[model samples]
Target chain A: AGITGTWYNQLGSTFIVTAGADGALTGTYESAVGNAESRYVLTGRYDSAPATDGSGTALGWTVAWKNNYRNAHSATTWSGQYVGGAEARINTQWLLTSGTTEANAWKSTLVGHDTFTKVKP
Target chain B: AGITGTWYNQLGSTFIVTAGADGALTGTYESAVGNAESRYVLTGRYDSAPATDGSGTALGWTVAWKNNYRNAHSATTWSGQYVGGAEARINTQWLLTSGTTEANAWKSTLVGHDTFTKV
Candidate 1:
């Protein structure tokens, strides 16, 4: 089982993810910041990897997605941790890059930080 | 008054730049590691900017180009620095991306770094 559910952030961004049985992760994230021109549509995928820095119980993931609106691309590497004992409560941090070159993805200026929790029914 | 010359790297990469009077930077960079199977052609352009950490003596540049050789369509961005002395010394670094999505461009596995000097 992996991070599979709908999550949201304070900025009206939502991420819908599915952790497949084949160790593949797929998701669609969207952001609508009030301004009609500020909307962003993102889709991503990742394979299994060892957690970058943590106990062996955790998993590290690298997801790459494209912005169809701008025809630009971005990549993020992150790790997931449960808030307490429930798989429904997860926290993730990722570094994203997008600009004139792939180098911008990790340059901090293009990197982003956020958290998402499983949307409960 | 900018880097307008021919440059090369150890990896068989070459850059031909033309710094225009209007602050426009236009160039074509190509690489042929060995035969036709490893050939790459790219084109890029930039206005002008300050060196990432330099004074007014040097000019900062950014250029992006696409790969027509690949069906997936790949892109690369390059940063340039003037090393001083004559107009023959310039250093640059670039990163490339390509895959199923634009996201593949930034992955380290797909990215690269190199240095170039006026030739």
Candidate 2:
């Protein structure tokens, strides 16, 4: 799909989808929070092949933060679609889960939204 | 993984994880909206093998509604973790997208939360 390349989000984080074959995707996320120096591994898939214009493509990716602030275990997932045009961008909603092993772990999940623009398309 | 089961959400939708091998998942979602008579196919994956207790298991699934009200094309995705205990459930946040070809397609997305319990 057209999602390949480096994307920067509103949070100032960098997401690079280095490989995308068929519907599978592999990427790295460099967060602006916690360990900004480390790149976390991410994997996900798109529902189907996108158009040449990159429209109508629904995709989702997950990142397992093996280590972060205070070395806490956390994971984040982003689901959204590609909006192609002069304003090409990826609009997504994300859920970040921390303290997975803690009781009421579900309560530890945080939800937010982000719009990513391709810095290197 | 203990996520292979039929779960019902607060929205009265039914999610059945019929298969789970390695970290891949195949499931069906019967929604309470649009066409409740149809079963939507779902595909997803877990970050790792879940514990027998199903705790700390993070997963995400997506469904492409090929046909719905007015026969519109829409897709929904859920990302959450399984909280296993007497109150075993899947707490997820979801985003549904429609009108993808529109210029303001991104604004056509909707977000919500749901807690699903095995029923």
Candidate 3:
């Protein structure tokens, strides 16, 4: 089954994500031609981010992602957001802290390739 | 937030789907690395295949997915499509397929070329 609305990243260095409205997220990334020059923003939070099918609450949910990256010259940037498990993995060491009281600093722990799908608009 | 567009799959050989457009999906897969064989007008169903949601409706939908690769062997493939939720490991079925089939069966039951989305 080929779902038309598609986005992919299993740690290939070229990242991408798209699914919007209500559970807002936007992502575009390019790295590995010398790897650096990153960007991030999942600037929305907790809009019923649940998707469960493994029996009793915990299929998926818990997201708070915020990102910003700098490279090629450096303007000194490394923004933040923490709160993991969007579908978890795009190289999931995934730290966006503050819940552990200053780990990655509460951008609500958002990291890469967790999970998202809205393909309509 | 970065979003561009690219799709890839690996259980083994090659089977791919692209996310360039659509809640209105109609795929044009150009499978390569010599497997260079493909076609399927991605049909769609499952408006809210959610009789439930994650905790209730299942994390991601696995309506029905069937894809087989035979190293330069044969071809007589028929296609069908189902809708699950949306998102889980660009690859985390790890084998990724236990989705779709939220029971809208009756031939509401349809196959690839399902298109409906304009916002």
Candidate 4:
């Protein structure tokens, strides 16, 4: 994984991913599992295999991801990370953001905020 | 607030949020607030931003952040130097990554990571 390369996100911005040009989309989700689900699958487009930053750092990218999950999905988002030939990559854990309480179902709240709220909050 | 811009993160792994300039419910965070909290939220998105490979040199985003609490939290963590902008940036706080432990924090830890500033 310490390869050292650059990656591009679904958006179009670029970054280092693994180690080299020998490197590395958006929303393509599965909905059967839940209410609104989106998916993003990344395809490494080969364009002369770009080069690195060459500054003595471990820069790289993730290059591609699908967005949109939950009810009423549309459009995809993009972002990425550099491996630095080190520790890079997103590991997520989703806690509840909303819904009713247990007492009267409205007395308590979820740890995570609603999707939009979570984005800006 | 959740205006969802297809953020080109400090690292560049993209995701979606809010209602949309594109469309739909927002879950994953792909932003341009240019900060880790605003950028990663998943990909080490804990609190780094202006991520690089776009670039910062490494991965430590803090701009307009003065060393005074009059500005932000963790004022001590302030770079007091370095910023990533493809021009590159760097910092040497004089910490040891020799992989041992002093207050039981473990010296063997990889925390030696530089800001990767594109200085």
Best by DockQ: 2
Ranking by TM-score: 2, 1, 4, 3
**Candidates 3 and 4, the one with greater DockQ:** 4
The per-model lDDT (C-alpha) reads 0.40, 0.67, 0.22, 0.22
RMSD of 2: 5.2
lDDT, model 4, position A75: 14
Query: Model 1: per-residue lDDT, tens digit, B1-119?
Result: 45677778767777666765533444555664434433333222222333333322222222222223322222344433344455445444443332222232124213344566665
What lDDT does candidate 2 reach at residue B30?
82
lDDT of 3 by residue, B1-119 (tens): 01113334342223233322211122333344534234312221111122222211111111112123211111111111122234322211111111112331111112221111110
lDDT agreement of model 3 with the native: 0.22
TM-score (chain A) of candidate 3? 0.21
Task: Write candidate 4's Cα lDDT for B33-89 as tens digits.
Answer: 444554322111111121222221111111111111121111011111223333433
Off by over 4 Å in 4: A1-33, A37-90, A95-121, B1-20, B24-119
Residue A45 lDDT (model 1):
23
Better of 1 and 4 by TM-score: 1
What interface RMSD does every candidate have?
A: 13.7, 4.0, 19.2, 15.9
Ranking by lDDT: 2, 1, 3, 4
TM-score of chain A of each: 0.54, 0.80, 0.21, 0.25
Clashing pairs in 2: none
